[PDB]
């Protein structure tokens, strides 16, 4: 999928996600839940600053969602 598969995968891996939004906003955290419209429940969110523990985001902000995993090794 476009972004829907970034998200299903992100929920599966519990892996951090960079949500690039509308007018130059970025949100970095974990996707708990999400729907087809890219509405999301998010935890441990860093807004690009500001920390937000739990958040409901509406889909129509979203341009692109990028994965940001932690990897061991070179």
């Amino acid at each position: 999928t476009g972004p829907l598969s970034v998200l299903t995968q992100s929920v599966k891996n519990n892996t951090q996600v960079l949500i690039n939004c509308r007018n130059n906003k970025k949100l970095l955290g974990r996707v708990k839940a999400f729907d087809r419209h890219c509405n999301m429940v998010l935890e441990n969110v860093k807004e690009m600053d500001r920390y937000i523990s739990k958040m409901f985001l509406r889909g129509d902000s979203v341009i692109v969602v990028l994965r940001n995993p932690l990897i061991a090794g070179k």
Binding site: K32, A33, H37, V41, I52, M55, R58
Partner: protein
């Protein structure tokens, strides 16, 4: 699915960010299938202006950017 999640947040206190970056703090009284959200005991802060106190506020769901949920909300049980 995620719309219902919102609909179970009656009596929460939340901070809603509007698309213009106005910040609405208040207690949820109802959220409807379009995410239109009704609050009571409201503190509305426009970007770079002193806040306005209000008894109630109703916000168009399409005017909403995100809901800053309470720290102690049990996300898991809301999403059965």
């Amino acid at each position: 699915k995620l719309v219902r999640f919102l609909m179970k947040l009656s009596h929460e206190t939340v901070t809603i960010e509007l698309k213009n970056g106005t910040q609405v703090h208040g207690t949820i009284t109802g959220v409807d299938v379009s995410m239109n959200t009704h609050l009571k005991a409201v503190k509305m802060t426009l970007k770079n202006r002193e806040p306005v106190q209000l008894e109630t506020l109703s916000i168009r769901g399409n005017n909403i950017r995100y809901f800053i949920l309470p720290d102690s909300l049990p996300l898991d049980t809301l999403l059965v």
